[PDB]
Amino acid sequence: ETFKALKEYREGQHNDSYDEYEVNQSIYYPNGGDARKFHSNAKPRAIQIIFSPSVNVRTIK
Amino acid sequence: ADVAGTSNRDFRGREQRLFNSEQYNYNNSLNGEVSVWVYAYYSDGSVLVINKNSQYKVGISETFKALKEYREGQHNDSYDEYEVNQSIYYPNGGDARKFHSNAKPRAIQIIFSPSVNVRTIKMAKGNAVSVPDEYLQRSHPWEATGIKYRKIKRDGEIVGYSHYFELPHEYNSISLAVSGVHKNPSSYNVHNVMDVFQSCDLALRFCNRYWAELELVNHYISPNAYPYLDINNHSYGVALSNRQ
Amino acid sequence: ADVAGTSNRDFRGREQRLFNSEQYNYNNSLNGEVSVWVYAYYSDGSVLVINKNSQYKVGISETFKALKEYREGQHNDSYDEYEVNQSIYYPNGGDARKFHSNAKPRAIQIIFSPSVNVRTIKMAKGNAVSVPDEYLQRSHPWEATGIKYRKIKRDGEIVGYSHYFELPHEYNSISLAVSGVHKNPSSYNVHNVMDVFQSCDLALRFCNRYWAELELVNHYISPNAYPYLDINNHSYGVALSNRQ
Amino acid sequence: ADVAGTSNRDFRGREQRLFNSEQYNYNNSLNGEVSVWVYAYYSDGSVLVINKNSQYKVGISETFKALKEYREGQHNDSYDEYEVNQSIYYPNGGDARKFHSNAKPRAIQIIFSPSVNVRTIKMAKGNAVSVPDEYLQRSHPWEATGIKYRKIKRDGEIVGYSHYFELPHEYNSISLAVSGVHKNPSSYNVHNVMDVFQSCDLALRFCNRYWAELELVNHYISPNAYPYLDINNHSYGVALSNRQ
Ligand SMILES: [Cl-]
Ligand SMILES: [Cl-]
Ligand SMILES: [Cl-]
Known about the structure:
The structure is cut from a larger assembly and holds 4 copies of chain A.
Chain A: H1 17-28
Bound molecules: chloride ion (3 copies).
């Protein structure tokens, strides 16, 4: 997944889409965008990766 | 004339030291201001500040709703946020489409000017329906929390006092009032009561949402010579007593 | 040990009776809360509650406009309702597209906690431009309406006081303030004045529009052990003095 | 110690030259990345970049529609642009209100990292319904276009390869896929197949629309040490082999 694809998207609700394009430009390069926020709440706060018990753990990358 | 910075006749230097000393001492006289600030920090990095400036005593009191983030001129999910409020006022009381409102404060800092007497500070930290301690019948209407205030210091002088507490848990849903009294080391009090009543009308309030602690430091705290303590424990303010 | 409910050594029963008695008496001490609620009832069945909780004395004061129904996150006919307000402030002063705004309150209930002294209750019921009695020059700024308050009782104990008045007529267009003082059967007063000034800052407010009296009973009054009187004359609240 | 830049014991200079040489050679090892970028240039001066970075081999494949300009959070004439697409898929197939969509790319640049083997580069440039050469039955699924790639060079070193083609005609309506394989000058291959299958899952993609080639140069190409060739034939990138 890209950085953008992991950001929160609320189907059928407002998503601040224009400001969030600007946030992305600021994340891709310091001071690269003109957003009206310091921290996007659409950024993930954590990631869990889970595999089924049929994976071989030594092959995980 | 004598040469600058070489003798006791540098009256420009003496007057600059007196000018600063007179500001520090004036603010501590009963003719001076006492001030309080409530900072409510949000997850998007923005910060609501409420400040009240008044003579003799000063305070701020806000509902749960009034401390939630409000973005002027932008979308605020207003209908869903009415539903979130009903769920916070009573479990399962609303029909919101989210688990956690990002408009809830993540932390509160209370700062007082150095003219407050710390022993007079009182806080009413209530639940989301504005009750101080679970039920009205058993509630003392405030706690005197001065022992928890840290000195904000610059160059050895106290420039303000801070009490900070995080609200990082889902159940941290509060209403808040705070009050402090201006220093009065004298025994004067009798005769001045209607003047204190007029101070209740004359107190000036300011409220604004700044987009980042950086912006709060640069455009709010520093230009007005106010005290502050940032997330990295750095003290801001201006030392004045006996200083040039 | 002795068997439960058979002897004077049921210390669990004694402590449960003391726990409740201590809450009732604490609320009546000068360390306790005094509280007031203003309920404004609308034709769609919804109810605005404003509550203030404070030590020593407490009150609420609202403009005509502030008591009109406001639906958060829904349409409120805001422009037409500015025009309705102009017509209420002065006959024929606005250009509204309705005869009667359904946002006007149909009735008001004022309830005080049982720690108020009823004889100290004062109401300023003003006209729509916030004048108590037709013209300022002839207005006394309040009426002491304690004689009209009914006792809200449960199991023989007074759990609160109620004053209710309907606004069913077209010309019933009001502004409203109310105030009561906490019981003080002692002769203590001198020394505590700045503490009362701090109580003015520390008072906590709550405001919300509930969609039905049922919802008010279930999600507001009952969970917080507050007193109430419903449209069918049923008393709600919790008896505590000498009770398990 | 010896003086800087005067002897064979300037180990800071030797380590700086090795650090850069090790990056160049690592990228060319089979442990290193191979990368491709597709740049689609629009008439308003904006540029969509898609980049894929992976081990062993890498590619990008996009429909006609996916290469059209999309302005996030702005109007995009979405209904008329569905109609334009129907007219491009089949003559007279749509009911658009324009002759030429300004969302169509005016040109494409394909750039590969210097770790690709140029002889392995393959392009499938299809018509607007994703057929490589007019009809499926007669289509070879790619053309090997490495001979057309120019060396992007800095300070004498190849920093990437470019193939650029304009789409200036009304009938220039394409779908596009490209693929290249990482250099492998060894005879090692057998044993590594499942590792290549995992590389297909591990390949990282990036996509963004920048508003100008200037902005692409300053905020995309240069900060990431990527190769590029601008409209004035200027080469960008960083020479590393044997260099400080
Ligand atoms: Cl003084
Ligand atoms: Cl007492
Ligand atoms: Cl290798």
